[PDB]
Amino acid sequence: AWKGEVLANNEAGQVTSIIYNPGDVITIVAAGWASYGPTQKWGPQGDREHPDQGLICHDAFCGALVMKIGNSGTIPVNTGLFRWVAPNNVQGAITLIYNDVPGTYGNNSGSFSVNIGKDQS
Amino acid sequence: AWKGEVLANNEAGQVTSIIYNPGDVITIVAAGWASYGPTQKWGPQGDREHPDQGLICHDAFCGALVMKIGNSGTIPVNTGLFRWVAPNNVQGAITLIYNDVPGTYGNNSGSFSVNIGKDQS
Amino acid sequence: AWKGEVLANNEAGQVTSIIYNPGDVITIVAAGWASYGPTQKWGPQGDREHPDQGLICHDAFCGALVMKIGNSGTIPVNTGLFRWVAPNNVQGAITLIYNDVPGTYGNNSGSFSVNIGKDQS
Amino acid sequence: AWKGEVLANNEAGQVTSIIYNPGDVITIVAAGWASYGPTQKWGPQGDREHPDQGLICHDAFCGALVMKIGNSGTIPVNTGLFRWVAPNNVQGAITLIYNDVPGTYGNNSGSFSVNIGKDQS
Numbered sequence A, B, C, D: 001a002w003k004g005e006v007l008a009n010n011e012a013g014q015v016t017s018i019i020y021n022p023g024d025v026i027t028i029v030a031a032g033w034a035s036y037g038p039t040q041k042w043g044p045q046g047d048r049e050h051p052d053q054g055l056i057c058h059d060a061f062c063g064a065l066v067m068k069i070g071n072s073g074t075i076p077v078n079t080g081l082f083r084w085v086a087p088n089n090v091q092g093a094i095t096l097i098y099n100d101v102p103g104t105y106g107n108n109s110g111s112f113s114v115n116i117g118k119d120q121s
């Protein structure tokens, strides 16, 4: 299992110790408060009122937690994933990333605290 | 395991199929959008800007997900709990509840979708 | 989880720290060598060649590992149980017992080493 | 998870659907009766009275269940393994094998029924 902080201003993402392998079942729980620029902060589902202006993940709101697994595209995490299996041919290191527009992370603030574990399979 | 919806206007709370027993380890993941009255909606951590005016759980924001286990007091759930063990002598049916002031649930809207499972122990 | 030894001469059984509750899934692995009297020893499945002369569990061989859950009848364990659920209305403390005829435990020898854990549910 | 039969006469071993990856925790439970030649049969710990005359696994009795993980040497399984982690650098497909001397499997009989699953990690 892995526990750690994902900074909202970390454009490259937070690498975890989790390597997702074929057949794995995982659970993620994310908590905390972060911002993509405004003084207000949002939880790991992000800001439901904000337009997508080129987010790294178009399937989650700006300010949401997302992830990549190896060479995958971004996959929404939001508050977490319960006993979750990846799509076919998706495998590798899990990197967690705050959802913002590339090149616009410098004014971000806050962080999410995230647990990831492998479940029975 | 249990999956279901917790309505923000449900003052009595949503009873689950989970009976927490001594020694159990549980994981909860909650998602979605709800309001305690305003047109805006918040995620399961609630509204970090809103003053506590008599919430059923003083350890979580207004609009957060909380729970009772048997005859316990309220316990924060927020976005979820990862491989969590209850305090001593806490046991019984898990009921999930939206955090608001007693008597003020009628103007609430939305809901959270919640998974609960028992982990290895 | 519980790990401990079950002596072949222990007529009363070895009480464990496991309380089986409704809905629980458990795994048991048993190992080792024991005898119901002869110089030879057998593993947790017991002696397949020996007639049942009034065993506490008629559904397992003499010398097998069996269990009781609360006030249940005896249930075969043998080498173990994989992600196992009890029959309806079966619940309570798990006691592990060597399968022999009542009153004939005094000449028994050896023991089994047993792990029990609760699985995801 | 995998469930299947391991024939005592199968010199090459039974390939399973389990790929052991770094960090994985696994549980195995094995049951049944098999022989390395004699009319008698033994459980998955094999025959404690039989000399090692060139067994594929010198750390288990003749007639015991053993395994290889990828290109590993043989590892005893016996009645099973509880929440088990492999030695460093051991990974790959799990193959289950009856412990006998190479070239002597033709007179073997019986089989073990085996479950393998991955546990939380």
Ligand SMILES: NCCCC[C@H](NC(=O)c1ccc(O[C@@H]2O[C@H](CO)[C@H](O)[C@H](O)[C@H]2O)cc1)C(=O)N1CCCC1
Binding pocket: A036, A037, A038, A049, A050, A051, A052, A053, A062, A100, A101, A104, A105, A107
């Ligand atoms: N009178 C003021 C008008 C602005 C209101 C609003 N636009 C925004 O609210 C807005 C808010 C914050 C922003 O912050 C920037 O977000 C980017 C990602 O989209 C980057 O993260 C930047 O770093 C961040 O500053 C951008 C637009 C707007 O026009 N809306 C809101 C719904 C559609 C109409």
Ligand SMILES: NCCCC[C@H](NC(=O)c1ccc(O[C@@H]2O[C@H](CO)[C@H](O)[C@H](O)[C@H]2O)cc1)C(=O)N1CCCC1
Binding pocket: B036, B037, B038, B049, B050, B051, B052, B053, B062, B100, B101, B104, B105, B107
């Ligand atoms: N010019 C307008 C002034 C109001 C602004 C604000 N007060 C509130 O924002 C407020 C907002 C929503 C409320 O909704 C009610 O919340 C209750 C729980 O506290 C019940 O759920 C009611 O059903 C709900 O309507 C109550 C107060 C306020 O005074 N603040 C905000 C920080 C401290 C100072």
Ligand SMILES: NCCCC[C@H](NC(=O)c1ccc(O[C@@H]2O[C@H](CO)[C@H](O)[C@H](O)[C@H]2O)cc1)C(=O)N1CCCC1
Binding pocket: C036, C037, C038, C049, C050, C051, C052, C053, C062, C100, C101, C104, C105, C107
């Ligand atoms: N020429 C010798 C004849 C004896 C052989 C055998 N009977 C037994 O092998 C036997 C062996 C051990 C026993 O030990 C006792 O077992 C009891 C439980 O059954 C108690 O545990 C006693 O403590 C133990 O001594 C009893 C009978 C027998 O008659 N068989 C074997 C298959 C059916 C026919």
Ligand SMILES: NCCCC[C@H](NC(=O)c1ccc(O[C@@H]2O[C@H](CO)[C@H](O)[C@H](O)[C@H]2O)cc1)C(=O)N1CCCC1
Binding pocket: D036, D037, D038, D049, D050, D051, D052, D053, D062, D100, D101, D104, D105, D107
């Ligand atoms: N009067 C008869 C003497 C034989 C008794 C015994 N040797 C064996 O019991 C024995 C039994 C079965 C065997 O079966 C063969 O085992 C091989 C693996 O070791 C292969 O599996 C062969 O296929 C199988 O036939 C081999 C030796 C022996 O000498 N012992 C037993 C303890 C040490 C002294």
Ligand SMILES: [Ca+2]
Binding pocket: A036, A037, A100, A104, A105, A106, A107, A108
């Ligand atoms: Ca930004």
Ligand SMILES: [Ca+2]
Binding pocket: B036, B037, B100, B104, B105, B106, B107, B108
């Ligand atoms: Ca309200």
Ligand SMILES: [Ca+2]
Binding pocket: C036, C037, C100, C104, C105, C106, C107, C108
């Ligand atoms: Ca006896």
Ligand SMILES: [Ca+2]
Binding pocket: D036, D037, D100, D104, D105, D106, D107, D108
């Ligand atoms: Ca042989």
